[PDB]
Every structure is written in C-alpha cells, then in structure tokens.
Design a protein around this motif. Structure first.
Motif, mmCIF file in Angstrom:
data_model
loop_
_atom_site.group_PDB
_atom_site.id
_atom_site.type_symbol
_atom_site.label_atom_id
_atom_site.label_comp_id
_atom_site.label_asym_id
_atom_site.label_seq_id
_atom_site.Cartn_x
_atom_site.Cartn_y
_atom_site.Cartn_z
ATOM 1 N N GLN A 199 9.807 6.978 3.523
ATOM 2 C CA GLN A 199 8.704 6.874 2.577
ATOM 3 C C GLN A 199 7.462 7.599 3.080
ATOM 4 O O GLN A 199 6.810 8.325 2.317
ATOM 5 C CB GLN A 199 8.421 5.399 2.333
ATOM 6 C CG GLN A 199 7.412 5.109 1.290
ATOM 7 C CD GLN A 199 7.847 5.599 -0.042
ATOM 8 O OE1 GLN A 199 7.346 6.589 -0.519
ATOM 9 N NE2 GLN A 199 8.773 4.902 -0.664
ATOM 10 N N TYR A 223 8.105 11.323 2.929
ATOM 11 C CA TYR A 223 7.998 11.793 1.560
ATOM 12 C C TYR A 223 6.540 11.959 1.174
ATOM 13 O O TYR A 223 6.166 12.921 0.490
ATOM 14 C CB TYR A 223 8.687 10.813 0.634
ATOM 15 C CG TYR A 223 10.185 10.743 0.755
ATOM 16 C CD1 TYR A 223 10.906 11.678 1.483
ATOM 17 C CD2 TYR A 223 10.874 9.722 0.142
ATOM 18 C CE1 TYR A 223 12.269 11.588 1.585
ATOM 19 C CE2 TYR A 223 12.219 9.629 0.235
ATOM 20 C CZ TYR A 223 12.919 10.555 0.955
ATOM 21 O OH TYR A 223 14.283 10.440 1.041
ATOM 22 N N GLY A 272 3.853 -3.420 -0.886
ATOM 23 C CA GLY A 272 3.088 -3.463 -2.108
ATOM 24 C C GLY A 272 2.054 -2.373 -2.248
ATOM 25 O O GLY A 272 1.397 -2.298 -3.291
ATOM 26 N N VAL A 273 1.871 -1.540 -1.234
ATOM 27 C CA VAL A 273 1.022 -0.367 -1.349
ATOM 28 C C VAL A 273 1.869 0.854 -1.046
ATOM 29 O O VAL A 273 2.931 0.759 -0.424
ATOM 30 C CB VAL A 273 -0.193 -0.426 -0.405
ATOM 31 C CG1 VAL A 273 -1.019 -1.649 -0.686
ATOM 32 C CG2 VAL A 273 0.255 -0.426 1.023
ATOM 33 N N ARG A 274 1.435 1.934 -1.487
ATOM 34 C CA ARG A 274 2.061 3.179 -1.093
ATOM 35 C C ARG A 274 1.173 3.899 -0.094
ATOM 36 O O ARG A 274 -0.014 3.585 0.014
ATOM 37 C CB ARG A 274 2.292 4.078 -2.307
ATOM 38 C CG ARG A 274 1.025 4.545 -2.944
ATOM 39 C CD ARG A 274 1.295 5.448 -4.107
ATOM 40 N NE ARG A 274 0.049 5.786 -4.772
ATOM 41 C CZ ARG A 274 -0.725 6.802 -4.417
ATOM 42 N NH1 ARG A 274 -0.372 7.588 -3.419
ATOM 43 N NH2 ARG A 274 -1.845 7.043 -5.074
ATOM 44 N N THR A 325 4.512 2.112 -6.330
ATOM 45 C CA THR A 325 4.279 2.237 -4.902
ATOM 46 C C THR A 325 5.337 3.054 -4.179
ATOM 47 O O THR A 325 5.481 2.904 -2.966
ATOM 48 C CB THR A 325 4.212 0.853 -4.269
ATOM 49 O OG1 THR A 325 5.467 0.194 -4.455
ATOM 50 C CG2 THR A 325 3.142 0.035 -4.921
ATOM 51 N N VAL A 326 6.090 3.895 -4.876
ATOM 52 C CA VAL A 326 7.225 4.598 -4.287
ATOM 53 C C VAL A 326 7.042 6.091 -4.489
ATOM 54 O O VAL A 326 7.031 6.565 -5.630
ATOM 55 C CB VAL A 326 8.550 4.140 -4.914
ATOM 56 C CG1 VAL A 326 9.682 4.960 -4.381
ATOM 57 C CG2 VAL A 326 8.802 2.679 -4.636
ATOM 58 N N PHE A 327 6.928 6.842 -3.397
ATOM 59 C CA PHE A 327 6.936 8.291 -3.514
ATOM 60 C C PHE A 327 8.352 8.792 -3.702
ATOM 61 O O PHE A 327 9.308 8.215 -3.186
ATOM 62 C CB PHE A 327 6.368 9.009 -2.295
ATOM 63 C CG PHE A 327 4.916 8.857 -2.114
ATOM 64 C CD1 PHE A 327 4.034 9.619 -2.839
ATOM 65 C CD2 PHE A 327 4.429 7.990 -1.169
ATOM 66 C CE1 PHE A 327 2.694 9.487 -2.649
ATOM 67 C CE2 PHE A 327 3.092 7.862 -0.977
ATOM 68 C CZ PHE A 327 2.223 8.611 -1.717
ATOM 69 N N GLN A 364 -1.833 2.470 -7.023
ATOM 70 C CA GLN A 364 -1.522 2.288 -5.622
ATOM 71 C C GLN A 364 -0.962 0.916 -5.283
ATOM 72 O O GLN A 364 -0.030 0.800 -4.484
ATOM 73 C CB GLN A 364 -2.771 2.549 -4.814
ATOM 74 C CG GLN A 364 -2.500 2.522 -3.387
ATOM 75 C CD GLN A 364 -3.699 2.816 -2.595
ATOM 76 O OE1 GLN A 364 -4.777 3.049 -3.127
ATOM 77 N NE2 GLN A 364 -3.538 2.794 -1.298
ATOM 78 N N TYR A 365 -1.498 -0.132 -5.886
ATOM 79 C CA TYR A 365 -1.154 -1.489 -5.501
ATOM 80 C C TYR A 365 -0.001 -1.959 -6.369
ATOM 81 O O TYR A 365 0.051 -1.640 -7.558
ATOM 82 C CB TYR A 365 -2.360 -2.420 -5.634
ATOM 83 C CG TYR A 365 -3.464 -2.147 -4.630
ATOM 84 C CD1 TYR A 365 -3.237 -1.358 -3.511
ATOM 85 C CD2 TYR A 365 -4.730 -2.682 -4.801
ATOM 86 C CE1 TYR A 365 -4.233 -1.105 -2.596
ATOM 87 C CE2 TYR A 365 -5.737 -2.434 -3.883
ATOM 88 C CZ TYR A 365 -5.479 -1.644 -2.784
ATOM 89 O OH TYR A 365 -6.466 -1.386 -1.865
ATOM 90 N N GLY A 366 0.937 -2.680 -5.770
ATOM 91 C CA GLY A 366 2.069 -3.174 -6.519
ATOM 92 C C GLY A 366 1.696 -4.332 -7.418
ATOM 93 O O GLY A 366 0.757 -5.084 -7.163
#
Lengths: 227, 218, 218, 218, 218, 227, 227, 227, 227
Positions: free
Chosen positions: A17, A20, A122-124, G7-9, G119-121
């Motif tokens: 992640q 990426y 929960g954050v990216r 939150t997933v690239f 950004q935040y889930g």
C-alpha cells in the motif's frame, strides 16, 4: 492478498500500500533541487493543461516561510494539505523558539505526519513526495520526503516522472559550489534530459536563495534567458 | 553455478527474438494469410461452377493440394514463431511468491492467448478438447482432405455406387475444405493481430515482471 | 518502432469498418435470412405433400441443394463479418491491469456473444463442444445432407432393401434438413439482432476502454 | 444514425408480439399438447394389445407417423414462438455496466429458462450436451423412429433373422416412441407453463431493465 | 389481461392436485413397487435354477416381458405424477428479485430432487449425462432387454456359434435384467419416499414463497 | 487465513503478521555491536545508493543521549520514528530521575511501544530491529529489540541482512575484554565475512564508548585505517 | 479490487473512489464563470423538471456573502451542505478579521473540508464541484473546486455535463477585459455550444459583479434580452 | 458491488444505497400539498389496515407547531422520529429567535439531519419523504424533503405510491390562487386519479391554513362533503 | 445479500434484519389487550415448561407503575431489559412533571429506544413486541410497540404466536364499552380461538383497570371462574 490494507505486512515484510502511494508520485511533473556555492535552488516543470488556465497561479514552488521553500509531486490535493501543514508547523516552531534553526525538524514533523498514516487503519497514505530547500544556521539544506515518510538530505535531486533521468544526468554532471548561473544552467539541461525529444520545455519555475539573503523567485523573462 | 545457467537461458532468447517475430507477423505473415485466402476464394469459385462425374473421382485436384499445403506451411511457421514468443516469456517467470503478481499475471494473460493461438486456432494437437475444435480446420488440413476424399472415392470407384448424392458429396468435400481454408485464414488473421497487440502493449512487464527498489529498507 | 506498429494495426481496422458491418446486418442480412427461411418453408411444403418411391433415391433434389448452398454462403458472410467486428474490438484491448476494467469487461462481454454467434450458432468448428451443438444445423449443412442422404441411397439402391421405413426415412431426411434451415435461420436472426444491439449500445467503450485525465496528478 | 437503428429494432419486435405469443400459449398450445398426448395414449393402447409377425415389418404404421409429424409441427411452432420471445427480450439488453443489474439479471434469468425450453426440452440441436438429453424425445422424433425402425426391419427382412426378441423389439420400438411422445408432451406442458408464469411476472423489468431519475443530480 | 392469465394457470393446477398425487404415492404406489420387486425376485429365482440350451434362444420368456412391461407402466405413472408436482411448484415461482429468496430457495430445492427423481432415477432421457446413469435400469428397460437379447439370439441361431459362454451370457442377460428391476425398484422406493417427505414438510413455502406485510410502510 | 490480521493467532499459536514484520528487518544493512574492556562499540554498513547522496547525512548510528546510542535495520521511516521516540523517552527519564541509571528500561519503554502494536487491531507492527549500546551505572550494556518487542542483552550481535553470518563468525571468534583496537578489528572482519566476495566493504560507521567518557564517532579516515 | 474503499490506493497510486465521485459531477447542469473588465460573472443552465416546479426557488447561483458567490454541480444534497459550510466559513472569517481579504482561503477551507473526506475511512467524498466568483482586495477571483479538493483559479471555466464543450469554445473565443455585455454574450454562446442542436436554451441564471459594487442577479427579462 | 454500503460511490458516481432508501418511500400512502390564494393545504390518503384500528390516531398530517405542518411517507418509525426532530428543531428556533420567520431553515435542519446519514458509515439513511406546509413571514411555503436530503419548494406535489399520477394530473390541472374549496376539490380529484378504478377513496385527512390564521384540521364530515 | 446488517437497505428499501427481528415476536406466547367501559384489560397465555417451575414468578403482565402496565412477547431477556427501561423512564417523567399525563410518550421513549437500534451499526434490534395499557388524563390507552419501533393505539389487539387468530376473532366480535366481565369473557374466548383444538387453555394472567382506580391483578381462582 497482502495488498489492500495499510496495516498488513507481506511475507517478505513489505507494505504494498505504501509502495503504491509511491507509485502515485511518478505521475507528477518533474522538479529538481540542487545546492550551489553558498546557496540552494529549485526548478520545476509544469503541466500546462490548456491556454485558459491562469499562469500566475497554483505554482509548483511554494514558500514555507522566508527561509524554507518546497516543491511537490503526486496527488495535488494531498500536496496542498501538506504544504499548509508545513507552513503551520514552521510558524509553530517560530512561536516556540523565536527562529527556525534547523530545517531538518520541520521536515521531520512533516515526515512524521506522513508516517503516521502508513500505520493506522482507516486512513490512506499521502501520495506526495516533497523537496525542501532553504538556509538555516547549519547552511544550505536540501531534502526530499516520500509517502513512507523517509527523509533524505542531498546535494541534488529530482522528484516526479522524469526523476530517474534527471538523477542520472546529475549522476554524470553535478559539481559542488558552482556559481548560481552555472547551477541553474545545469538544472535546465538536466530537466531537458528527461523530456522525450521533439517535446520541448516550456517556461519552468525557478527559485533560489544565497546565505544571508531572503527568497527570490525568477520571473518568466529571467527564466527565458536560459531556455 | 546456477545464475550462470539462468543467464545462458535468458541470453539465448532475448527480447529481440520475439520482437523480430512480431515484426515478421506485422509485415509478411498477414499478407501471406491474405494471399492464401485469395487462392482459396479462387479455387472455391472454380469448384462452385463445376459439375462432377466419375472422372473427377479418378484424379485429385492439385490446385486444392497446393492451397492446403501452402496453408499447412503457414500454420507451421506461425506455430514455431508463437512457440518462440512463448519461450521468451516463459523463461522469465520469476520466483513464485504469493504477492507482487502484477507482472506475473500479465505473463500468464499473454501466455493464455498464445495458448489460444496454438491450440484453439492452429489445431496443432492429436485430439481436440471437450470444448471442441472452434477452428474450422486444423494443422493437418491436407490429411483430413485426403482421408475424407479417399473414402468417397472408394465408394464411387469400387461396380461403383449409384447414389448421386455421393457424387455431389465429392464436390461438396472439395468446396467445403476450401471454405474451411477461407474461414480459418480469417480467424487466424484475427488471432495474430490480437497477439501482436497484446505483446506490443505488455512487453515491458513481460520482460521485467518484478521491479522495485527497497527504498524503505536500509 | 512499437507505437507505429500499433497505429498501423488500429488504422487498418477502424470503427467505421465494424459500423459498416452493422449497417449491412441491419439492412440486407436480415432480409436475406428471411428470404432463405421462406425458400426453406416452400421447399418443406413441397416435401410434405409427396410420396416417394425408388426413383427419388436415384436423383438428388436440386431445390434443396440450392437452399442449403444459399444458407452456406449466408453463414460464410456472417462469420467473416463477425470476425471483422471481433478484430476491430480485439486490437483495442488495452494494457492488462488489475484495475480500471470497466471498458475491458465491456469488451470481453461483447467478444463473448460474438463467440456465441460464431461457435454456438454458425457451428463453424470441426467438432462441437461438451455443451453440444445448440444450433439445429451448422456451417456445413450441405455436407451433412449429402452424407446422410447418400447412406440411405446406398441402402435403397445397392438388390435394394425392402424396408419401407427406410424409404420414409429418405423423405424424412429431406424434410428434416429443410426444417433445420428454418430453425437455424430463426435463431441466427435472434443472434444477429442481439449482436447489433450490443454493439450499438457499447461501441463507445469498445473503442475507448480506458479514458480519464490525471486531474489530481501534477 | 445509431438511435434510428435501435429504434427500428425495438419497433420491429415490441412487447405486444411476445404477449400475443403468451396468449397463444395459454389458450391454444396447451390444448394442442393435450390432444397430441391423447393421440399418443390411444396409439400406445393400440400397440399394447397387438402381436406382431413378419408382415408388420413390411409396412410402417401411418398412425404413428401422424402422431410424430403432429408433435414435430408442434415443436416447430413452440421453438419459433420461443425465439420470438427471446428476440423481444434480447434486443432490450441495455448498456453493459458493472452496476444497476437488477433488471439485467431478470432478463438473463428469463433467457436462461427460454434456453432450457429450446435446448433441453425441444432438443432442437445437432448433438446433445455433456449433461445429456433430459428430454425423452427431441425435435427430430420421426427421423429417430424411421432410423431405429429401419435397422430392425432390415434385420427382419433381409433370409430374415430367426430371433424372436428382434420381432418383439419391433413392437417395443413402436410402443417406446409413442411413450416418448407422452412423456415429452407432459414435460413440454410443464416447461411452457413455467415460461408463461415467468414472463407474466417479470415483463415490466424485461422491457424496462433500467429506469430511475437523476433526482439528486442537477 | 395478465392477472387473469396467471389466475387461470394457478386455478388449473392447485395444491390439491399435488397433494392427491402425494396421497397416491404414499398409499398405492409403494405397494405397487413392492409387488413388482416380488415378481422380479420370483422370476430371478426361476432363472437362477435353470440350464439353457438352444431352445431357450428360440423363444422369449413372457414372464420377464410381463415384469418389464409392468415396471415400464409404473415408471410412466411416476414420471407423469412427478411432472404434475413439478408443474404445481413451477407455476408459483414468483417475480425474480435479488432478495427475499427463502421460499424461492425452497422451491428450487424441491425441484432439484424432483429432477433427480425424473432424470437420475427413472432414466427418462435419450442419453445419460456425463455423471452417467446411476439408476440400474431406465425408463426403457424392455427395449434394452429385447435388443441385448436379440443380439445374442442372432449369434446363437444364425450354423450357430459354438461358444458355451455365449449360451451362459443368454441366461445371464435374463438374470441381470431381473436383477436391474430389483435394484431399480428399491432405489425408486427410496427416491419416492424422499420426495413425499420433502413435499409434506415444505408445501407451505412451495405454495406461498413470499408473504409478509408492509407493516412499516404507510 | 491466519495471516492477514495482527490480532489472530494461528492454530499453532503464532502471529504470522509479527514474523512477517521480522522479515522486514532482513532487507536492511548489516550492523553489529560488541562489548570490550570497559566499553562497547557499534559498527554499521551502509547502502550507498548513488554518488549524489550526501555522505555526512542520515547515519545508521544515532545517539540517544551522551550515554546511549543505537543502530537500526528495517523500514527506515519506522526506524526514524523509533529513534526519536527513544530520545524523547530518555529525556523524560532524565527529567524524572535526574539521570539514566539503567539503559534497560529505556529499551523496555521502546520495546513496550513496539509490543503494543503487535496486539491492537488497526495498527501494523514496526518493521525495525534496534541495537542499543552504552554506559550506565551497571556497566556497558548492549541490547537488541525486534518487531515483536523481544529484548535481549548480549556480548555481541548483528542485525540486518548479513546478521547470521556476522553472528556465526562471532560464534567462532569473540573474546571478552579485548582492547578497543582489537575489538574494532574483529568487528570489521566480522562485517567482511557477511559480504559475498568480490564485493568489497566501503567506509562503514563505527561508534564506541568507554567507562567515564562520552561518545566518540570515528571520522572516515580513522575508519580507513582498519579497512 | 482497489475499488470499493476511499482509503485504498491502486497499484498505480490512484484513488478510484475519488474519480468515481468526480463522475458524479458530470451528471449536473452546465454552469460557467468568466472574468471581464474589472469584474466577474457566473452563468448557469437549469433542469426544469416539470411545469409544477417553482421557478423562483432553489437556484444554481448561490450567494456566499455580498462579496463571494458560487455555483455547484453534482449531488444536490451534498452541494447544499457545501454552500452552507462555505457561508458559515465566510462569516467566521469576517468575525475573526473584520473582512474577507482573499476569497482563496474561503475556497481553501471548503476544499480542505472536501479533501478530509477523501482520506478517512467510514465517510464518502463529496460528489460536487463548485465555482467561486467574487471581488476581494486582490481583484476579481474565479475558482473551481472538485471532489478531490483540488483548487484552480481561472480566467473562465465550466462545470457540469457540457463542461468539455464550454471549455473548448472558450478555448477558441475568450478574451480578457471584455465589457460586461460582450462577456455575457460570449457566455451565452458558450452555453449554447454545449447543447445538442434542436434542443434550445431556456432561461438561465446569470450573476455578476464589478469592482466597488455589490452583487447583482439578472432578473429573467434582462436574461431574455440575450437569448 | 457498489451496492451494500452508504459510503461507496458507483463508477458513475451514484449512491445506490440512497436510491434504495428512495425506493422505500414509494411503498407509503399517497399524500399531496398545494398552495392556493393566501394559503396552503395538505391532503393524505390512509391505509385502513382493519376495522379494529383506531381512526382518531396515528395520523398522516402532523403539526410541527401552530405555523408549520407536515406529512410523511415511507418507514413509519423513521417518519415519527423525523417529525419529532422537526418539532424539537422548531421549538429551538423559537427559543433562539422568538418566532419562526422562514420555514425553509426548519426544512434545512431536518434535511441536514437526513443528509448526515447518507454519508457516515455505520448508519443507514432515513427511508422517509416529507412535505412541509405553512405560513411564514415570506408567505405560504410548501416543501418536500427526501432520503438524500434534497429540498424542493413547490406550488403543489405528492409523495407516496401514487405520486407520479398525482403529479401528472396536477401537471394538467393546477392553477394558482384558487379559492380554498376549489383547491381542495382539485386535490381530491388528483388523489382519485392515482387509484386503480373500482378501488374507491375512503375518508382522507385534509389540513390547511390561510395567512393570518392558525391551523385547521377538517373533521371527517367536512371531508365527506367533497367525496 | 441485503440481509446480514442492520444498516443496509434492500433494493426495494426494506430492512430484512428488522423484519427478522419481527419474526422473533411470533415465537412468544399469545397476549391480548382490550378497552372496555371506562377501563382497559390485558390477558396473557403462558408456556408452563414443567411442573418444577414456580407459578408465582416471572409473569407476562408487568406493572410499569400504578397507572401504566405492559405485556411482552419475543426474546425474554430483551423483554425484561425493555420493561425495566420503561419503568425507569416512567419514574423519570414522574420526577420531571409530578405525574404521567400521557402514556403515549412513555411508549414513545421506549419505541425511540427500540428504533435507535434499527439504525446504528454494531447493535441488533430488540426482538420483542410490547402492549401498554393504562389510564392517563386522556382516558384508557392501549398500545403496541414492535422491533421497528412502530407505535399503534388500538381498541383491542394481540401479540405473540396466535396473534392473527386473536385479531380475526376480535375482527368479528369486539364491541366498545362492554362491562368488565363481558370484556374478559370475550378475551378468554379470543385466546381459546387461537389454540389448536384438543390443546386446552391452562390458567392465564389477567390484569385490568377502571378510571379512578388503581391496579388489579386477578388471582388464579377468579381466573378459573371464566375457564
């Protein structure tokens, strides 16, 4: 698999992640920075999306104060949130200590903010790399910072799409303590060595500082003198 | 030494061999397929305007033998060059991991359609699968022609048979196998252009399936 | 140069070729299928009101040969034009990624029903699959007619056989293969209209499967 | 113009054609199936109380030919009308998306059982699948009757054979194919009523698979 | 009117028809199966204590013909009544939704084992599937008896053959098909009791697959 | 399976997520530490990625105070966050107690910070091992700490890629109470025994401390004298 | 895949969830804005759903104060929540500073609110783009803001369904410092160039300001004079 | 797919979860509202589930105060929670400002409450639409609000199952400024045009207000006079 | 599918989880309530699981005070938590207002507690229906409340397994303003009409109140007089 969450190591111990998010950096415009004799400079290419865009607006070199500056590459919304966090952090250090003595801890606070989101669920991550350049009481500093949070201090670097090419050209051509004009000429030649020929370099941004002076943006004509 | 063996393999069949194969397919092979299709169309036009008696069961038409032998040599060259591309890809399948399989999935996706070019289109096997033979004719078209022709010629010559529909089936075997050459050349053109497209789009991951610096590790 | 090769492929078979094929299918092809169906219905009406003796095993009816040859030429044109559409789609399947596969799924969904038009409906293969042949008759209808007719004509002519049900099976082979032409033209009309609908709804993603600006990246 | 072509297709086969087919199936077709079943039961009752000698291998019973030909015409009408419903549904399958597939799933669920009516029940193909032929008899019942009858008639007539079980197999072929007509008419009644139910419950989504206003978008 | 058509269908085959079928299966059908099993056991006991010569290839035993014809009529009645239950269930499969499929899953679970009763147990198809024929004998037991008997009778009568194992194979065909009647009646008893159990437990959801008030909606 | 969450034991009671984080340590550069007569030293290899990198910058030996030092291996962003947490924790203990009497509890606070994230959902572990070395009121201490949080005190160790080799050579060659020059010579020979021959050792970092003195980073020439 | 969480690239470093939120913008009505001589204007099309709708009600041009205005496109519920957040933020800046000196930070506060939900889930993005137009102490400003949070200042732009047409016509036809009547005529011609011919433009909304004046909505008749 | 969470956009930028909550609205009873000369009215059908139900109890027209009223359709439990939230919000505005000057912000507070649950994970939307009708200092207002939170002000509308039919008849037949008796007669004819004939309209609820007066529920006999 | 979470609507806008909680109510014992002349009563069947059970213990009629009572059906643990929440809520209203003037808001507070758990993730609904009966200053009130939170006021009702049967008999036989003895006789006949014959009614609980009096539990002999 080991792939769709920030909180999951791979069996080799990698965070795909985060890498990426590092692949997000390679889609941005190329920018470079280099140290020269008593100073440091930044040069940045720009996507000019159309002729209806404002030139004199959102710019790839951003001032963090009168004695730290920065360029970004990657997701532009994340990058703007980052530059504003860097500005607020620099002003907090100035309130606390009266001055900014080392740029490295400003970079460290930004990088710890970036590292904190490679860890909690929960954050990216932040899909942005940054280059910081400035004068502090140690001297001219020049950094980069990446989506993982890794800090590196350099003589010269690039970020963005043409990064490798620019680095390779500096891997043949960079010398310390050049005068400012020669250093900018080397940087423009480096940025041209990353383009695919036929495609030509439109007007880039260049900033520079020498020790004991404040900040200095080249206007477009002074940039035209080197193209 | 093991890395010496892997290096000898990968220096044997570099990327330039497969790309030279792709250059041969884009330039000469498609023109050869179109020429075989035109020869098949001309032969089928000759057969369509003909009425057969006993004497056409006494000799085999050498025009159809030439068309089928030409198509057989075409499919041989296509199969060998497709195997060259398959070997260039297959000797670079990396260490098997449960991760980092983007380029590995690219390699399996290209090998799957090269398998479709070889198996399902050229018909280069002993027996067709449970999915059948979706190609109209196979690698061994000329043996199928001579066998299915020889059965009917045995039935016509022998006192010979008196069924007129057998005599029309003779003409129909001739016309149908030229028709199979037409349809098979068309489908082979489609499969070859699909393979050329997939290679020229995916060769960067076909050669280097796993890149990536340990930037974070020091 | 690689982009030159991809550009030569995609300039060879543009979207206008496939759309001209769709114009030909909407205008002339369906009328041709209906005409073949009416000829089959008239021939089946001729066969239904007939009583056969030995003399009908001495000649092959040229009306049924004309209907079957007409249907064979129809299926040849439909298969070649379907392969043209298939090539136009297949040379634009983009770089294989594990993402952004909306248009790629559109392309595979259209290629699946073009495969159903070619394989399952036209019957243009050597052997049918384990799912069988859901078409009533195949690409090679006339060879099936002449073979299944010639076996019964050999049994009737020879002293010939004395089974009356063999003589009725002669009439039944004639009627059944005209019936197969009727059913196959109906199902081919359905499949052709389905392909026309899917192309005219999905061609924007068939040609450009991956669009999208890096607005966020600078 | 593309929307003109789609409009010509959808004005060719409206909903009223399929609903007229459903009216024909609910009213006349089921009564026709029941009448064919009663004719098969009467013919099987005639065959059950009979003892055959050589003379029954010298002529074919025209009652069974009438029953089988009647059932063949029935299955032809059912297949053509089922293809009409299939075309009405299939020319309204919308733009292929990875969402909003409630009505699309309804359309595929109805086309699946229309496929089951055509393939698995009417037996209207060349070869049955790997699942077999779960219908007791197919589209081409009368050719199966005449072929399996003609083999036994050839064995009985020839000096003819002396096996009495061959002579009983003659009677058993006659009785078994009337029995197949009984079982196939029963299963065809079940499949037709299932298709009528599914259409009359789901036609609102069969015609309009994707409705919905952009209320939220302005 | 559409609801009138659905109402005519559902008033044609109510629940009482299927429940009358279940009453017939629980009362008379199982006793009939047991009686056929006892007749098969008695016939097999007759065959087991016999030594055959040429004269047993000159006549067919009418006891075995009676047992097989009785079993054939049994399987006909069972198949028709199973189709009656299948139609009663199948005309109440509701509007196809992607939800609320408890009763729909009950209906498909009951139709699956009625399919197993018809296909896998009664053997009422043309060809068995790739899973084979797990029934010991099928719907058409008596034709299999007469065919496999007639081949051996042709080999024994002809000068006839001198193989004694052929003569023992005659006796073995007789004994084995009575054995098949025994095993098939046992498995048919098991399948019939399973269907009776599943219907009498699940008929409330078979008839009304979707109930439920919009209490929350006003 | 038992595989993609930190909070899930295996049927044998293993945390594969933690051991995968331990696999992140093996991709780092080799560092070692060893005790000698009244003192302790650290030696560390470095990846020199290019010639454009600053030498005199981000260094694998980091000081935690004038009497505790540390080397890291693994994820470098996590490692920098860890070294900064260790520095803040040491200064908190100095506020509370006036001095650092035992290095072991500084190691324990760092290791409890590392253990806390092998337990709670929504965080990942720290893919870093550390070696601590220094003088306290007990004597010279030398530790390692791993992604699980496991603490060990040693005479000598390595971390990183060549760790096993550097352990095995010390498993033949280490003696207590060597003079400092002999101990560094043994360490350089140990680090050379982990390379794959042909590949040669460029200039590594070495720190050392003796009882009653503060730290002492070797400059590059004093290192060159042992190569 | 990389597809159903904010939150997933992606492996290319993209957030498909954000770009899907950008696809929600394309279903709204076309609006445009352009700078002219000492001023700035906004023009907006409207879906007139039925004849039973109120005309003089929910309008696509919304005032943020007497010296900032805005148009929206996308999900209308999100858009109304956004315009109300912008109004509250403008009034907070007026309480703190006495006046609004730069529109850009009002846009920045709205855009940071929009970026925070990429950004935040557990939250979704805002499927709305906005155009801000007004006078501040720098001059006439004109912005757009998008579901990612990206801010751009322009001479002229569109948002909505016909955006690519309206930009392209402006990509041929826009000139600086037009008088106001000519600028509105250019805008109406631009909006007509996005329709599919046969379909005709019903009465759109137009707002505009010149320097030193307040706000000015055209009523419908003054709009009719340009149709 | 894009289907089972409130926080997930579709690839076209749709929230199918919200539109399913909008499908929940269509199962309720039909209600309508319309403006007339100096006033506004509401009419509502009712399911009469049995004869054992209380008539003079839970009613589809609910008062929010003496100068705002409302009808609902959808999930009845959610609808009751909504009407009580609207009542509490109206009384809070009356405490803060002394009076309710615009109904539109009462509608906006209810709609922001409804929009807030189309965004955060772990809640579902409200499956209810509402119509608000009343007098404020602007005049007669008439709104609807939907599970997305979208607010619209109308001359006349429906909600519920027969909504489309009741809209279409009003799309032929509604005129402004009718006297009250004619407006109610038009509404009853509109509600009858949504039934499936054979089925007949039992006694519906009707409320109305004129400017300067308070609230006024028709009793059942005054309703019978129009059936 | 749309099936295993409380926060997910169906494509038809249904909450299957809530209706599944409503299916829990149907496994409880049948209870009924009805109004009569100046009063209201409750009747309840009981499962008598064994002879070792205490009779004079956990009872299906529960007092909420001296002027509200209730019966439950469904999960008995949830039902006891509900009755205790209702008691605490009634006593809170008595502290705040000195008396309980309307039973309806006690029912509303219980039903809002039940509705709150049909909305937030991580809780399940309450699988219980309740009937409230009592005297307030309006008169005799009789309610039911369900797992969705839907409130209805009735003349007469049931809950539990035989509910439909008990409703249908009341749908033929209930009259207003019966004397108390006739009303209880009608209720016992209603409860007997839900049994499957052969199975006979053992001693049920009956409570009743008239206006101006307090609460009154029939003891078992007085119940025997009606069996």
């Amino acid at each position: 698999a080991y792939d769709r969450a920030i909180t999951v190591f791979s069996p080799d111990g990698r965070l795909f992640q985060v890498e990426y998010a590092r692949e997000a950096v390679k889609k941005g415009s190329t920018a470079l920075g280099m140290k020269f004799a008593n100073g440091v400079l930044l040069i940045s290419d720009k996507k000019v999306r159309s002729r209806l865009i404002e030139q004199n607006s959102i710019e790839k070199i951003q001032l963090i104060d009168d004695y730290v500056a920065a360029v970004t590459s990657g997701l532009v919304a994340d990058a703007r949130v980052l530059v504003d966090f860097a500005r607020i952090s620099a002003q907090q250090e100035k309130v606390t200590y009266g001055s900014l003595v080392n740029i490295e801890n400003l970079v460290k606070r930004v990088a710890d903010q970036m590292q904190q989101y490679t860890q909690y669920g929960g954050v990216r991550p932040y899909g942005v790399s940054l280059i910081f350049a400035g004068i502090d009481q140690i001297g001219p500093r020049l950094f980069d910072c990446d989506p993982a949070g890794t800090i590196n201090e350099y003589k010269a670097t690039a970020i963005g799409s043409g990064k490798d090419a620019v680095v390779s050209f500096l891997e043949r051509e960079y010398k310390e303590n050049l005068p400012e004009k020669e250093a900018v000429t080397l940087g423009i030649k480096a940025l041209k060595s990353s383009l695919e020929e036929g495609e030509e370099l439109k007007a880039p941004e260049i900033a520079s500082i020498t020790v004991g002076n404040k900040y200095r943006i080249y206007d477009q004509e002074e940039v035209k003198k080197f193209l | 030494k093991r890395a010496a063996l892997i290096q000898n393999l990968r220096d044997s069949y570099t990327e330039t061999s497969s790309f030279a194969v792709i250059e041969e397919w884009a330039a000469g092979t498609l023109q050869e397929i179109e020429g075989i299709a035109k020869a098949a169309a001309e032969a089928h036009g000759v057969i369509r305007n003909s009425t057969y008696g006993r004497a056409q069961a006494e000799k085999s038409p050498e025009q159809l033998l030439g068309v089928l032998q030409r198509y057989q040599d075409l499919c041989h060259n296509v199969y060998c060059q497709a195997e060259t591309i398959r070997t260039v890809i297959a000797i670079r399948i990396p260490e098997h991991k449960e991760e980092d399989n983007l380029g590995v999935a690219v390699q399996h996706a290209v090998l799957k359609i090269i398998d479709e070019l070889e198996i399902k289109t050229l018909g280069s096997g002993e027996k067709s699968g449970s999915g059948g033979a979706p190609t109209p004719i196979g690698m061994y078209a000329l043996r199928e022609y001579l066998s299915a022709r020889s059965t009917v010629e045995d039935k016509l010559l022998g006192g010979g048979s008196q069924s007129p529909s057998l005599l029309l089936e003779l003409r129909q075997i001739d016309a149908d196998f030229m028709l199979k050459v037409e349809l098979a050349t068309t489908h082979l053109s489609t499969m070859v252009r699909a393979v050329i497209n997939a290679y020229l789009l995916n060769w960067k991951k076909l050669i280097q399936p796993r890149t990536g610096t340990d930037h974070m590790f020091s």
